[PDB]
Design a protein around this ligand. Sequence first.
Ligand SMILES: [Zn+2]
Ligand SMILES: [Zn+2]
Lengths: 619, 600
Amino acid sequence: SLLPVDIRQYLAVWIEDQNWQEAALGSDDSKATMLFFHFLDQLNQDPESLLLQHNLRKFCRDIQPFSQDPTQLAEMIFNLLPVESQQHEIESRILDLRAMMEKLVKSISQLKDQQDVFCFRYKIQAKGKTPTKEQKILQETLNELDKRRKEVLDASKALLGRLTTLIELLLPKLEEWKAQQQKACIRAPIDHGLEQLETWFTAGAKLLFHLRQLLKELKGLSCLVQDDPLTKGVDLRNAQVTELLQRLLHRAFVVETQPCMPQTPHRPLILKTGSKFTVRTRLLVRLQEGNESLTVEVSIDRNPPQQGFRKFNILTSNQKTLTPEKGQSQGLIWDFGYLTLVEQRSGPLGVTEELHIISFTVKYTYQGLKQELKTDTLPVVIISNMNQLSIAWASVLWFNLLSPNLQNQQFFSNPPKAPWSLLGPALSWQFSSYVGRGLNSDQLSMLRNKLFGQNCRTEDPLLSWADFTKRESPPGKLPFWTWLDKILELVHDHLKDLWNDGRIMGFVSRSQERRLLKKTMSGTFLLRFSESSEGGITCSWVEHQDDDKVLIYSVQPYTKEVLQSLPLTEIIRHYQLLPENPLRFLYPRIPRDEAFGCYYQEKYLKHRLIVVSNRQVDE
Amino acid sequence: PNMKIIGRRIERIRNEHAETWFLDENHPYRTWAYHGSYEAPTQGSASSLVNGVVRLLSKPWDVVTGVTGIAMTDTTPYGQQRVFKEKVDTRVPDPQEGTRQVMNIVSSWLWKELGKRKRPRVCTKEEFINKVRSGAIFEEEKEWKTAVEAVNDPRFWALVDREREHHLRGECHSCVYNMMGKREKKGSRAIWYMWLGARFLEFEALGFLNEDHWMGRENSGGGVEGLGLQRLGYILEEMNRAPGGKMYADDTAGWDTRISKFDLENEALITNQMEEGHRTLALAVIKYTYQNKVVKVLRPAEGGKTVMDIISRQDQRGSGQVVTYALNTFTNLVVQLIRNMEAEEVLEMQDLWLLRKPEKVTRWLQSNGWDRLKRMAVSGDDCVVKPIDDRFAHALRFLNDMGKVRKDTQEWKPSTGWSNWEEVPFCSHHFNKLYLKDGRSIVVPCRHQDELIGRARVSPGAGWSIRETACLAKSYAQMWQLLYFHRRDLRLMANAICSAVPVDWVPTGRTTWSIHGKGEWMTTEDMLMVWNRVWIEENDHMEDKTPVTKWTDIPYLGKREDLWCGSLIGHRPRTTWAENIKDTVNMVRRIIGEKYMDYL
Ligand SMILES: [Zn+2]
Ligand SMILES: [Zn+2]
């Protein structure tokens, strides 16, 4: 510690028992001065151990200037009383400059009184009938005022520097949250919220507006009775604080909740014409004048591409008004429901491959400061029928997983390839959000082999947009995304609890299926998703009939047409094949009635065969 | 430097600190005599200790610099060295031969006149035991705790007798000055004072000047020693009655620093009126303490450590000598007489070089001298004269040749006299004549409010304990009640502080340092009884001794003059302070105990 307060241990009980934090500041300096007096009262073994007895005296003199500013001594006592550490830095800087703001307020409050006593004593000297030595004492206290106001200007600049650093820290945090929300829209498991950013932005804004107020108060006082340079200095400080305030309010207006139809909460940024949707904008600066409401105006495609791009207008209204009472109750938030979209009756990209951007504008005003805040949502796709809901979702993912620039509506005119390191986890996120379980490494590697093949010697392969939505997947009559989406729908609607408890392998290759079912007892079966039929689950059990033979029976895949009137657990419960049940154990070694017993409720089919020769496989 | 006089002292204080003894070659002393140095602990502070009661009861004045900058005194070795370099390390050119001759004639005549009715005498120990108060700052290995303890101990008096025998044998081994500098903002002063025994030697040798009132107005005509601030205004008005020009109250810039070897030479002329043994003692004190002296002063050194230097000088005057005030008053009387003679054209410019007809100086002195004395009031370096005409304004040749240059005035510009005796400065005060409800007159001291409050805010640092602070605040409040009742804010603060401090207590001391602060406010007696005793009962200028009835009957001075002398009435913070005076006095009663009387 640079400050000298040695051997705190002797009077440690005293200092530890003291009320330093209460004496940091308060309604009465009297408590701090009482701490001073009784501290001195306290300050009053071998002599070699009593050598510091002299050192004490030094301290007892060093704090003599603190008898003029007792809050300074009490403040010394009170202040002396890792992936994300940036949160702590933000909060600590905010607290620091709040304390500095209190000190600056005290400085202004006493400078006003000093100027008032200067005027009160200049009136008398001007009323003197002599108009000379006391005039120079008056000029001396005037020079003291000049030095004080220079100190005030330097303190304001020291505040501006730290506030600038705080804003330069705060804005990147908000952009990081924007990227995290972009990931969260496409079903990534992220828990977030603008509450913390609200507190940070609002602390910064409150202190900026407070400084803006103090500068005006200062200027009015400063003139006393533009001759002083305090006018120019206050004007410069005011220009600077206004620059910082505008720089903050620029990004303080964001879209808290992206537009999403209430019919489909799971999939945002897909909007059907005529169907209402729900957007939500928030102003992170929770500062609102209690006498005037704030209105947000909505527009669609402010800068439409100049190409066959369909035009779209808004039915009903394009405004949300927030009264100050509601703004206090719920924060400065505009939640747009009942927003409907309609095409204006009047290229190579499909209907689901064109992107639209919904923008919002506010005329914000607080403490005389006015500014127009503008922000727009993530790009959106507009469908004509719900039968596009699936494929249109493939347009959302591919953007929010790979678009660098979010203002790119020409994204699918030249779509980039999705690396597997990004696409795999997203395919996992889909299941994770929509249904209980995600995708583990085995099923993800199965999908990787299905998309790229076992030969791929390139780490993190790139999947083409055409190979993801348009090119068909070889084993079946469905492209990869449509097939996986129908699988997701099948799991959610008919296999949710089965998929949650891990009773379903799901994505295993035919070859891997045989490899796993070779070294198991007859009657062991898997539940895997059919790569040939659209949205179908198939069951495959192995049987050994000869020393060299291992037959793998499979069932014709069960789709929604069968599972709507007969659950899969009941089919496994009573397969009744010609007549003992061939499904004896679920892989690896769980009894068939045990792995599905909890799903059984109280109160034909077709098969296929693939024979694996034991020894020709053993080669 | 006459080493045969200071050598033993230098060597003794060298042997006291021989481990760190060294001879610095980078000392900033140009007019003094450097003899060595030694490391010493740092002392003092960059700012004085502030009283709690005053700061909490004078909330509005926290903003005006007039009561704050006065407490911003740094007694740290850096400030002490700066004050020494600026104020003390100066060299006065010797006056011309005729000037010194005139000085000798006037000084001899004045010493004879002050002794026409008085005879110098010894001063016993009992007198000194009385005068000592409840520093004893020793400079060598024999050290004490306080002066009242050392003065009652026999070993102290034996240690003093040893040095007395040394003075009788022509040697000197203990009388060493200790200088403490004090830097302001301005009026930064250096303080000299020897240890208790050397000052007692000074006392026994020369204190008859003080104890026998050799500088009193009765015996000196021009002096004012003994009179309090409650009578100097009467002195000034009675001076105003006499015919002549304006009244002049010029101040000498660093009076103590300007006293030459010839001033001390002409002050030592009083040795011709003392008995032979008294003469031995007093001549020893003069030549081993006044005309030859060694001082110890701190100076900052490298590494944060402070080093005390042992320095020596011959022709100057210290501050804490037992008889420094009397000799200062004497020399100032001689100065004013010489300037009067120059003004009346008795002394011309050619008498500066060599006084050709010295009788013209004696004749004047015998025909007019005493009269001029009656037309002047001299308290040490401070003085107010009323000459026979205004030629006194431009009688400057002998004043400047003696080195007594005037403060805040060009060297050869005529002085400015006051036509109104209620505006003339005397002892940092002016004096105003105000009337009671009986129509009777009262001349009363007054000064600016800012200094009166700032001097009340400081604490010596030896009264750090809260009890000391409270008792000293009561001292200041009752001093205001007795001397500055005519001020609105001071009356309010006095009635507030006396109500905040417990009534049964006794006040500490140190309200003022002027010899005119007699200290009648240090008693628990009813302050109105003290006021009546000082202003009506024992007042020789008050004929009708009819008493007053209460402080509500005490006259404030006029509002306009009050506002002019630093008042704050009518100010919004002042009015809010007066309104919340009850809140503040009750909050100040708290953190102490006890406020047994409400004076509001
Ligand atoms: Zn001596
Ligand atoms: Zn006055």
